[PDB]
Write a protein that binds this ligand. Structure first.
Ligand SMILES: N#Cc1c[nH]c2nc(N)[nH]c(=O)c12
Ligand SMILES: N#Cc1c[nH]c2nc(N)[nH]c(=O)c12
Ligand SMILES: N#Cc1c[nH]c2nc(N)[nH]c(=O)c12
Ligand SMILES: N#Cc1c[nH]c2nc(N)[nH]c(=O)c12
Ligand SMILES: N#Cc1c[nH]c2nc(N)[nH]c(=O)c12
Ligand SMILES: N#Cc1c[nH]c2nc(N)[nH]c(=O)c12
Ligand SMILES: N#Cc1c[nH]c2nc(N)[nH]c(=O)c12
Ligand SMILES: N#Cc1c[nH]c2nc(N)[nH]c(=O)c12
Ligand SMILES: [Ca+2]
Ligand SMILES: [Ca+2]
Ligand SMILES: [Ca+2]
Ligand SMILES: [Ca+2]
Ligand SMILES: [Ca+2]
Ligand SMILES: [Ca+2]
Ligand SMILES: [Ca+2]
Ligand SMILES: [Ca+2]
Ligand SMILES: [Ca+2]
Ligand SMILES: [Ca+2]
Ligand SMILES: [Ca+2]
Ligand SMILES: [Ca+2]
Ligand SMILES: [Ca+2]
Ligand SMILES: [Ca+2]
Ligand SMILES: [Ca+2]
Ligand SMILES: [Ca+2]
Lengths: 145, 145, 145, 145, 145, 139, 145, 145, 145, 139
């Protein structure tokens, strides 16, 4: 039986078997849903989480449990992506991590927050500035269908 | 209800809960529409508004309310896109913001104005320059279908 | 100029120069828009109007003028689509005609009303039955993006 | 505040202003979510409902609230679709109605339950039999990507 | 030096080397342009011409010359497709022939006329009724871009 | 845990709560894999299962395990599809069922096996005759 | 050394291992080229080939070789496609076979000749006739790019 | 009635109400058509014009009429693009402007001429040099389909 | 007989015939499958592999065989992809190589681990670092179907 | 028609009426075909030609014939691209030029040859050095 109340402590990690190398690992999460803060009205999003690990790697079952812990939680989309990133940063202490959320529209408008991070003072911080400044140089076509 | 002539007063905002890191928040607005100043004939576009927030963030519903205010308003597409950015800039005081509108053609011709901005004298101004200089390097294929 | 409340009087037509053979003439109308009866909020759709003419054919510009007349008019999508067909039917007296509208979602739900008609008692009535019975057998994938 | 417990009683309807003709009305519902009856695990699907109205018509907002009521309600997917069709049949007494759920996979296996109904003994009963014998003759490619 | 004044006599044919067999042959003509009758305003279309031949086959250079003969000719789209079909019928006396034109929009609306023919009293006449009644059972998505 | 030996006894059904109407239920199964009839080399397919239930319905997880058990099992194609179809018939005894497997082409050869069943003495048996007839005009 | 004069004597056959069944074997030649018989000018196409064998199968390497023997042969496209089907028919005595060719444009017009066959008297014959009747209902979009 | 003879003098402009910032304005022109100087054969292309405005802005309808003036005007494609850029530079005196033609093939060969310009000695001259050194580093796949 | 216990001793190499050049050789395994080390449960993916050789090349048949030796091996996806790259690195001593894996979802989450390498000290090393920094900027849309 | 023997003498240029500015001109050529270096088997490619003219420009039809002449000609790849590039240099003597050929993979091997030239002693020679550097980070 799962908690639909925000619960960061469900997250787990496992050791990295290839530390001495930089690789990407993406999590496609098309089943994310949470609630709006004022109304309690359900919101929906596909979330892409890509990160380069150091020692600790996020185990996907826990990711799933952590993503399920937002079902009854009423927060804004931009906050949501950012909270998702902070807890993952604290969990793994990764070299680089990015969170890209794509929500379904409300009142004809859809919100896609994009946030990232690079271990401070290193070249991943530089990459994060790079991916950020070159972010969505060509936004994808959307027509709400 | 719904005003249908320019009304930037309807825009509202909320505190940025993650002020200490840069992140993009994009609004896909494919249901936008307004009028042509002289003829009165209507036009339609999809507008992408990406921005890196400082301390204030535009409230979604109010953004919707703001774009409906152009339904009975006559303006050019270029003007229109700059007007939008101005009254987001003034509302939020963002680190960076850009507005890319893609209009449906008249006389077989589509107009896609793109404009952007970064706080004067900060690294966001260099970004605004970068993203503008490298803007639409590979234009997308249009056949008007 | 441009009236923005129901005005079916603006529809015009011209003689069918090829009365002696059946052929479809489709109007892709992706710039359609109107209001919701109670709220006043606006909605958008793409409307496909295919028809087999008899002796009269709707004049394109007037069709445009007719669809602009729904810009400030409150109605439901289903009603709206039937109203359109009625005042094409009455204008042209076609052998067959159908109206398929595809609306942008509200509360996460899109409404695609489809309606059709063939002259009472002719083979076009069998067509109307066929095309309705076999209509949208394989619905298209919608994700609201 | 809402509630996410099965609530068929929240559905509303309005008179069909166009009773004298047959036409289809489809609802694309990509945000459907409910629970597995045992585990308690959330599940997701895209639901397409298409019906031919008699005298009543489901009001989309009521359907919205109705579909949300499944959010914290457990049940297998095949029942789920039947339940949705029954509730609409009682609400509207349609000439015809079909429901096609497309669920996301569990264990790399996805279930797409299709149900339909014709007003008993009328010619729609035969349509239901036709659309069921001819249902999904050429199924879509699914790889779970 | 080519005539841009309607000229059907430019068309040529060659004998069929495989009469005793039914095969399709499609001509994709994305470079078609003509003028509007009232204004002289240029119009544009991609035209697909598919036909099953008998004895005579249309030589493509002549098709090209015939399609170029419309550049200064001011006719309506529906007429245009139909005239294109009649002259091809007279030229070849084919078993079956279809003409599908797709024009670029004017005033936000695009017109796609579809017309066909089967040698009268034969099974191709039946096919023509078939392709007609099953015509565009799923119109393609259009948004004027 | 898991059995990779053919294991039809893993299948499990639950009762159908709606028997007055005919409705389809499709299972998309794109992770099917087994061992080929001779070489011993693996083969892969997406298996599309559609059926009109009668009184019994197949539980998804049970089905998932059932299909895995074919992982280290060796038998020809057509057999492989009917094996499945038949176990599903013996499990549910439905009105109609059809199993279509699309193997990743090994020669220039598709090999997409299509079988179906209609309950004998019924209209479903004519439907099976009907779909099978339409299936091959276009796979 | 190679043969670039039309040479069907190159085709080899082998056993169908699946004589009991009806499976389509598909070949796909993306770079076929011959010559215009009128001038000596080269032409180019993609050739799609599908057939259900009986006893025989064409060994695909001799098919590629066979297709290269057109490099210096003058013939029209319609003729060309039909010739390839005949030579395959004579080599294999297939149950069913079809050849769909897609040529690059010349004079801004591209020719796609489609031809098929089903053993006479069999259901394959009838299978081929259903296919000519429903061949390419929705032609793909071509813009010559 | 129009005329289709080279007419640069038909271009109009309006003051740029937003002089104090840099922004791009692109025109997608898919209906461009003109003539080959010798043969007299029509030719077609999709033209993308993007410019950064200083004090003037081209009026889209004037550009429409301007682009139509090439309809019965002969010229190679590389000149054609230069001519269009020059005429716009004189009209507007832009900070920056680039023009990219994409022509349909002749002899299976298509020419895509790209031209640009920076206000002399200003920093746009350097932008032009940047967008020219970096122009088309990863060219699109073209097969003439 | 086959090997379904992890067996890298299966890989064979051969000569690069193009030692002077830098060409990517691509392999594409659409049906890879292993096992979860946690439970014994099977997992599935498509494996993309690209590498620039030096002296050696992997004989592709032993690559397929090598990939099938994972059928019964327990390991996570990140680990798995990295192992394949290592074994290829040791066999070929490539100039550059990357492995991009795409797993089917489990718990409604799919894992795509991407990893690469460029000979240390060379430009290939730097080539690999540019790629990690610009890897998958726009993630493809995933909806689990 | 037509010559299918290598025939560089078929190339023809016309003067450039705009020499004060640098502009690119690209020729998309997806119907290139020639005979391979050994077997004698044909090979096919789409050839992308981009160049900044100086004073001379290549006439399209002349180019079309030029490329056909490679139809019954035998020579290796890299050679084949430079042959083209060089004849184009000798024809136009442009500021910059690059020829990229994308052959339909014969092994699992692309073979996409990329060459370019910048006029020596100029900034174009640095641009050639620049593009060539960026080309291979992603073909
Ligand atoms: N839930 C919710 C929201 C309601 N208004 C919002 N506005 C913004 N910008 N973001 C949000 O996430 C929401
Ligand atoms: N309405 C209108 C317009 C007419 N000419 C225009 N030209 C430009 N650049 N923009 C516009 O919005 C319009
Ligand atoms: N506006 C509005 C609507 C609110 N409920 C609705 N229900 C239906 N079926 N249609 C509609 O157009 C609307
Ligand atoms: N939830 C859930 C389920 C678990 N097994 C199932 N089996 C079937 N046929 N359907 C279902 O919805 C489920
Ligand atoms: N040209 C032109 C036309 C102007 N109005 C039109 N209306 C229709 N229905 N068709 C047409 O081709 C035209
Ligand atoms: N080559 C060539 C041709 C020149 N005119 C043609 N006309 C047709 N229908 N087909 C062709 O192949 C050719
Ligand atoms: N029209 C025409 C042409 C004929 N040869 C050409 N060569 C070039 N480079 N450009 C052109 O536009 C033409
Ligand atoms: N199998 C398996 C797994 C279970 N949790 C996992 N978490 C991660 N990051 N990767 C994996 O492969 C798995
Ligand atoms: Ca939320
Ligand atoms: Ca969409
Ligand atoms: Ca406007
Ligand atoms: Ca388009
Ligand atoms: Ca309405
Ligand atoms: Ca979509
Ligand atoms: Ca459920
Ligand atoms: Ca898929
Ligand atoms: Ca016309
Ligand atoms: Ca479009
Ligand atoms: Ca030929
Ligand atoms: Ca194309
Ligand atoms: Ca020209
Ligand atoms: Ca193409
Ligand atoms: Ca594994
Ligand atoms: Ca998908």
């Amino acid at each position: 039986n799962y908690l639909f109340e925000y619960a960061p402590d469900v997250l787990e990690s496992f050791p990295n078997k290839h530390v001495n190398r930089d690789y990407f690992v993406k999590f496609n999460c098309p089943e994310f849903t949470s609630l709006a803060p004022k109304t309690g009205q359900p919101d929906f999003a596909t979330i892409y989480i890509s990160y380069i690990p150091d020692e600790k790697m996020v185990e996907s079952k826990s990711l799933k449990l952590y993503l399920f812990s937002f079902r009854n939680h009423g927060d804004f989309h931009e906050d949501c992506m950012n909270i998702i990133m902070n807890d993952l940063i604290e969990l793994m202490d990764p070299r680089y991590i990015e969170v890209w959320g794509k929500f379904t529209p409300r009142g004809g408008i859809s919100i896609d927050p994009y946030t990232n991070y690079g271990k401070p003072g290193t070249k991943y911080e530089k990459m994060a500035e790079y991916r950020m400044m070159n972010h969505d140089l060509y936004p994808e076509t959307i027509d709400n269908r």
